[PDB]
Amino acid sequence: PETVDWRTKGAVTGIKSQGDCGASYAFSAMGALEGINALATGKLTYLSEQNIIDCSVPYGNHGCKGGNMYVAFLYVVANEGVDDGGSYPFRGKQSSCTYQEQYRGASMSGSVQINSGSESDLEAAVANVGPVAVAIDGESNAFRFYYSGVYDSSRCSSSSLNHAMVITGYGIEYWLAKNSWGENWGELGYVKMARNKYNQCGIASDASYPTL
């Protein structure tokens, strides 16, 4: 298809704000999982980024100071589940791990990594599977203060990436990415990024999604 948006399938939750906590990895990872789960199960369940922040330090994440999607997925697989938000809510900072099995919202068996730099493989993932976790270069003041339109940056790097989000669709040529800086940033917390511009901002350098 020429354009998808996974809200069409009820596979995307509201926009979140990570506050002053540097945990996009978590928000980005949970976002893909929420989608995959909502598609399969038919019910959208909000999942807990706080769970990932508190409990994935031993898998090699840094709580509120940063981390990866991969390492968040390993935690989910090894811990055989992630709690949902309702019962494990965002506090804005690293707290004790209160992971409880009774509130396990979702589980998974692995992650598929999209071939680094390939946007046609990325589109194929997004169209045929679901929302895909990505990371980008959001260094620019233009990104930091993006408000509307298609982001099409000349200064963007395709290798050293500093911010993670969920691709929830694409259209016309852009990607539709969901950020976690709350609803007052971008287009309702969304950004439309440049599609098929030879991997601008490294959108397809480190894309993945979970299996379940």
Structure's resolution in angstroms: 2.4
Catalytic residues: 163, 179
Cα separation of 197 and 30, whole Å?
A: 27
Q: Which residues contact 53 (CB under 8 A, 6 or more apart)?
A: 21, 23, 26, 61, 63, 64, 94, 95
Place of tokens 């971008």: 186
CB 64 within 8 Å of CB 23: yes
3-state SS assignment for residue 172: coil
Contact 22, 65 (CB under 8 A): yes
Domain extent, residue 106, equals 4-211
Total of domains in the chain: 1
CATH of the domain at 71: 3.90.70.10
**Residue 176: φ, ψ to 5°:** -100, 110
Q: How many Å separate Cα 45 from the centre of its chain?
A: 15
In angstroms, the CA 25 to CA 29 distance is 6
**Both tokens assigned to 31:** 């976002």
Experimental method: X-ray
